[PDB]
Assembly symmetry: C3
Homo-oligomer: 341 residues x 3
């Protein structure tokens, strides 16, 4: 037993950026770019086999498959092997981060890469990723279900395998989930004694060029909401903080930012309008308030369901970053199509 699946999603997206620093014409406005873009098409193979008494073996190989022909490689999307049974589920491989799964109730938009921060809640999703790791998921007991996941010190840094001279970048991920009559709330987060971030607060591999080492890197996320009776509402809160670990005068100083995201949608028959807001409060960088990281964004859109597998998509987004003259505003809109197989 093995099945083939995936989804092909593409559309045309119009965008324009307002930046006074990089564009000098007309009050900092760039020209409007119109493109055909892949919304992240993917194709995978998964299978399962009953082993006898309550245990089943499970594997999956999923790849990024852009219909523009820009992707390549196997298992770059969730791909794994594991075992399931009464005890729950245990998987190893390129695995989604518990915080990446919790992303399903946080970001419901589709878009191309270039517009992932204005046509989708991309900024609050800068903490999500896939890591080579092991992961446990306990069954659903009384509406409760949980997940614990770990990334080895030698998987987070291979170069340092035999000479442990760099602080371990090993990390733990966990999440808890409660569901009842259409009401659901969940906590998801991750902690890393030592890790590296780029200037976009995203986690990068040790020794990336412009990467800033950090200590006690922790990410927290709580998402609660209602999903049933043609109605969907979702509020999410997220806190991120770490201590500067880059040798120099500012080592030890604190980094932190709070983000909130809101989304609601109603299902009229085959049309589902939807709206989402997101904000990133002023961020503390090296102990000081940094307003460059503050942002406000709102996305409105609707999905037309031709069938349970095919949808037509339309959406627009207004995004503002920073404050003052270093400020950047992004507006974009798209129309596209999604087919799940």
């Amino acid at each position: 037993q093995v099945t083939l699946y995936g989804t092909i999603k593409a559309g045309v997206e119009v965008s324009r950026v307002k930046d006074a620093g990089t564009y000098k014409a007309q009050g900092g406005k760039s020209k409007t770019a119109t493109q055909i873009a892949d919304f992240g098409s993917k194709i995978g193979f998964k299978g399962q086999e009953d082993l006898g008494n309550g245990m089943k073996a499970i594997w999956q190989l999923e790849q990024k498959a852009s219909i523009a022909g820009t992707n390549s490689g196997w298992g770059n999307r969730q791909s794994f092997i594991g075992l399931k049974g009464g005890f729950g589920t245990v998987r190893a491989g390129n695995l989604n981060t518990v915080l990446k799964d919790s992303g399903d109730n946080v970001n419901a938009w589709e878009s191309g890469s270039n517009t992932e921060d204005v046509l989708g809640l991309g900024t609050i999703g800068r903490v999500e990723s896939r890591e080579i790791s092991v992961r446990y998921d306990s069954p659903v007991f009384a509406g409760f279900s949980g997940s614990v996941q770990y990334v080895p010190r030698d998987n987070a840094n291979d170069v340092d395998k035999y000479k442990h001279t760099k602080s371990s970048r090993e990390s733990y991920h966990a999440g808890l989930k409660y569901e009842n009559a259409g009401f659901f709330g969940q906590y998801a987060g991750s902690f890393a004694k030592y890790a590296d971030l780029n200037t976009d607060a995203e986690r990068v591999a040790v020794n990336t060029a412009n990467a800033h080492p950090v200590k006690d890197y922790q990410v927290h996320r709580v998402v609660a909401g209602y999903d049933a009776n043609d109605l969907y509402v979702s509020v999410a809160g997220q806190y991120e903080a770490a201590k500067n670990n880059e040798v120099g005068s500012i080592k030890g100083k604190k980094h932190e930012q709070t983000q909130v995201a809101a989304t609601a949608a109603y299902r009229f028959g085959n049309v589902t309008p939807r709206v989402s807001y997101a904000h990133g409060f002023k961020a503390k960088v090296n102990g000081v308030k940094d307003a460059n990281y503050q942002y406000d964004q709102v996305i409105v859109g609707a999905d037309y369901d031709f069938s349970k597998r095919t949808s037509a998509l339309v959406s627009a987004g207004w995004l503002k970053q920073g404050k003052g003259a270093g400020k950047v505003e992004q507006t974009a809109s798209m129309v596209g199509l999604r087919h799940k197989f």
Copy 2:
């Protein structure tokens, strides 16, 4: 509903090149090289879903899959998503160029890459390609069927997305087709206000190293012929011209070349002999006659059909390029196998 398809084609090809400039031994003759080569094996996944009243959703991901293990990546061959119905068909993605489809009645040979110009009509097919774009194909009305296709300015040049400082490389492609009782004629072509060509008259991405910018780049192709009753005959004509747009003394001057190709084949039971000729008249480069682009080529061969999906292939080709001492002659022959699945 989703299907798996592709074809595996390989063979051994013998070749020798006669060039007085690069080879000094024996009147300019090179040694004879004999290789095992992939004839362009490929594998793809496509699927369709009825949406209700006369509309069907359609997608396809096809990749180059060489059995020599030299290819990599997804959707580098025609890959797309679109909709079909009474109105015809509409597709977006890595799509074949209307001129690339018209190639089916122009080049019927199989070969490895190194011999695509001597074991196949490759020179007349230097205008064919795949471009990220949208494309319309109207139904077949009274033997008539048509196709209109467009490649965005920001898809033909991504770097220039927000600062339109480079002339648009957006292009249009169209073709018309008539079929009646085994008789068929079609026009296919493309126009680009601005584009770039390499010295082989092939279109390359803006800012390729040795790439010459051009203006009013247009390609025309007419192919007519008979295909039925065990008989196949096909004549094709092709015109290409553009104005030099490379800043300097020769900007504005005219480039152009006319190419013709002929092919016929008769089906004795399971054997199908075939022969093809092709010529490239002297080309006008910067207004001046250039005989380096002139060429003559003839390919003879036969296909043995073991079954409708499997064939045995044999072919030879004599090709002469240019005139005089800069002249190059290529001769090659091959025996191979093709399995379609």
Copy 3:
């Protein structure tokens, strides 16, 4: 007719290296590295079609598919097209080397790349590989079955296609096999008039940076053993020798090394313990005895079969290389899982 297959295999492996030259702490011992690693997962598509009277067409595209997401490309594992029938089988493409197939009775261990020499008989398998080539396999007559395979001069070196100025790196591979009532012995080997080796006695492509050209490169392997009644025993012998062909003072001098490998395993119900030993006698490099190439290794382990397709794996290995102060000792152990589909 076409089928999908492959296997997903991963596990965690603990390792430590003892080298006095590269590690200075504690008598040359490195720290112990613990990793999650792909044991070489792979996925392929193969198909066959009856052509009529006793002939069938056969093709296969197999790719390395790591569940860690580190592989990419098509047909990098055995991939081919060919014909089968009364006469036996004939294939062309990325094909396994006759010596690579004989590897099945020589190395029965699973492991990640980093531990292929301590958790598997990797050193004796440094002569195995895949080469673009043609290959014949004659049927099994009276327990006897044979294989002859060849790699073209222009496939082993493409750059030199038209100017044969580098000595041909074309090579021949052959093997013979006898099987009777659980008893089986086979010879497998390869010869190359000219070839290139790296310092690990592995064959590399001409013009690799640190590659040493050789002449009369021959590899011999005899493997005999018993496989039936829950019992498996296998002894293998291997000889390798070539003449230095690197221009200089030592050209012409002789290189050679003898390797032996032993493995046995008994099948209690679903558990199969197993043990293997391997030795590499002192090697003659440029006529002189080199003890750096001498080695001793022993691997113990067991496989728990959950089902015919799924197994649980456990293994450990002690490996010593060289002699004296340049000496290197490797110890490693792993626990993992393998699912065949």
